[PDB]
């Protein structure tokens, strides 16, 4: 039952405070037995490891179980369950009896919450007698051992709240192995790649900066993904030997050619993993915390956003700046959290510019579609908001975008519904409360900034309000060129179209509609001319928006925001 020497203390990295504590709370009771016997003190300790799943709790237990060399008893909660009436409780009793008989010994109750769940809620008889048997077992250790040979019980669980309070109190030490920091992620990558061949240009400082929400388990997949990149080129050379061996798309042929050479293998040359592969591996790997609840990064870049230079400078200084280089903004005394409220008339680019920031910052992105978090049950709407900021904090830096936010934070009045007033007060505490949310950047977009609660629109929650209004005559030239060149006439005609007095009051959405109406005028011109050539004598002309088509659109498209001042004020 001796611990196998397959996991090494070097295999666990990024945790140093934890390994510093375990040197006096696990190593000393088990290895320094004589020191405890000098004072006649029974130093039987119990250490509970808890944290997010994937934070190397099981590997830490096995790492320190091979670094000590004492008897190790790995226990999995389902393994102590039997079909007989009394066999289930007898198996747990035999575990602690054997540990005392083999003192000094280390018990590892991995996933202890599976069998040691609350007996005050799970009202069964086997389940309650298993919990009571563990308490009795963990107390026999403190008394039945020969004083100088202590027994330490290690338990790991990612749901410490499910434990029975009468059992959770029996673990003197609880260690919270949280998500690794930037310094810790660098050490984990080195310990995961220490047996691999790297191309000597791997900058782990950059790798740690580009993995904001990763845990120890997630970083293993990045190394695992990066390894497959190096061997991707060694499979194409294998497919070439198969494609040229023989005389249904391309992927289907690969699965069939490799099936044919099933009894024959080709040695793969050893290759190093370059920095480009690692940078490519990070994009292919989604963090365990990012699996659900996170929106896909918008495709919009700054090349899609025309004009809005003032808005672009504010969003770069408030969000994109601190995300990319937080060290510079920390020195001047800028908190790593921003609150931006984009507001203005509809169609002027509020959502577009907030989708470029989510894309240019290259950070994690969560998008909320108006009142998307509301639920019919009493507590499920406030719980969704609290869980929303729990994910964002765990994966900082993160950008929270509230599109059409006036439906989620209505101004709190007496006439306001109670169910919609609890969500507002929930957001007040999440944005700025006892638990600071540093690393969460919030963007709000709305047409009615005066309908947002006045407590939200304060610094620390949504500090800055950026007005995104109607473009000027000079701005409409940049926007029309931006819309045209991103969808394919030249540029001299686009300037004439955008500067026309018929485009007075056009918003950003009207210019996009103007281009569509010009394209529709092009198709009518194509349709009529195609029939005339086809019928008279095999007929396909090039569809291109000509200047004559822009004339039809200008006489067809009218502005949509009739009264900008209704949205320009307040």
């Amino acid at each position: 039952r001796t611990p196998p020497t397959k996991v090494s203390i070097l295999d666990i990295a990024g945790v140093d405070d934890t390994l510093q504590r375990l040197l006096k709370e696990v190593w000393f009771p088990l290895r320094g037995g004589e020191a405890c016997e000098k004072m006649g003190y029974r130093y039987d300790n119990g250490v509970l490891l808890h944290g997010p799943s994937g934070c190397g709790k099981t590997t830490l237990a096995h790492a320190i179980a091979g670094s000590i060399g004492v008897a190790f008893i790995p226990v999995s909660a389902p393994s102590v369950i039997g079909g007989t009436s009394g066999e289930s409780e007898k198996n747990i009793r035999d575990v602690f009896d054997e540990a005392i008989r083999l003192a000094p010994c280390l018990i590892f109750l991995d996933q202890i919450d599976a069998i040691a769940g609350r007996r005050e809620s799970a009202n069964k008889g086997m389940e309650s007698r298993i919990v009571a048997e563990i308490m009795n077992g963990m107390d026999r250790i403190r008394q039945n051992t020969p004083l100088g040979k202590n027994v330490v019980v290690l338990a790991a669980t990612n749901r410490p709240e499910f434990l029975d309070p009468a059992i959770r109190r029996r673990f003197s030490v609880e260690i919270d192995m949280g998500m690794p920091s930037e310094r810790a992620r660098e050490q984990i990558l080195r310990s995961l790649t220490r047996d691999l061949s790297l191309a000597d240009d791997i900058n782990f400082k950059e790798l740690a900066k580009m993995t904001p929400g990763y845990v120890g388990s997630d970083l293993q997949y990045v190394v695992k993904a990066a390894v497959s990149e190096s061997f991707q080129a060694n499979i194409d050379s294998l497919l070439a030997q198969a494609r040229a061996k023989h005389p249904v798309s391309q992927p289907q042929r690969d699965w069939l050619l490799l099936e044919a050479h099933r009894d024959e293998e080709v040695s793969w040359p050893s290759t190093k993993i370059t920095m480009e592969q690692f940078r490519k591996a990070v994009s292919l790997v989604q963090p365990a915390s990012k699996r659900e609840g996170f929106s896909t990064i918008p495709d919009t870049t700054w090349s899609h956003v025309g004009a809005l230079e003032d808005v672009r400078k504010k969003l770069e200084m408030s969000i994109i700046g601190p995300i990319k280089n937080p060290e510079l903004f920390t020195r001047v005394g800028i908190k790593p959290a921003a609150g931006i409220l984009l507001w203005g008339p509809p169609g002027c680019g509020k959502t577009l510019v907030a989708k470029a920031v989510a894309n240019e910052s290259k950070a994690n992105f969560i998008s909320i579609k108006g009142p998307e978090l509301l639920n019919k049950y009493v507590g499920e709407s406030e719980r969704a908001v609290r869980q929303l900021f729990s994910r964002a904090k765990s994966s900082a830096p993160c950008i929270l975008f509230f599109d059409q936010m006036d439906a989620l934070v209505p101004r709190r009045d007496d006439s306001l519904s109670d169910a919609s007033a609890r969500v507002v007060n929930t957001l007040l505490t999440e944005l700025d409360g006892v638990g600071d949310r540093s690393g969460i950047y919030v963007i709000g977009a709305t047409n009615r900034p005066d309908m947002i609660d006045e407590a939200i629109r304060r610094p620390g929650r949504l500090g800055t309000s950026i007005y995104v209004g109607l473009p000027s005559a000079e701005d409409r030239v940049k926007i029309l060129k931006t819309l045209y060149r991103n969808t394919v006439t030249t540029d001299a005609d686009l300037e004439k179209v955008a500067l026309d007095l018929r485009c007075t009051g056009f918003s950003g959405a009207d210019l996009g509609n103007l281009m569509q109406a010009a394209a529709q005028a092009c198709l009518e011109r194509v349709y009529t001319q195609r029939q005339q050539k086809r019928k008279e004598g095999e007929e396909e002309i090039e569809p291109v928006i000509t200047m004559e088509d822009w004339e039809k659109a200008l006489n067809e498209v009218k502005p949509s925001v009739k009264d900008p001042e209704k949205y320009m004020h307040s």
Binding site: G83, T84, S85, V378, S417
Partner: peptide, 23 residues
């Protein structure tokens, strides 16, 4: 004859709801 431990079905619960008012 040995009696084995057998798992069974679970109980049902109640859920509160919130209802809006147009007035």
């Amino acid at each position: 004859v040995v009696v084995v431990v057998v798992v069974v079905v679970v109980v049902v619960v109640v859920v509160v709801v919130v209802v809006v008012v147009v007035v």
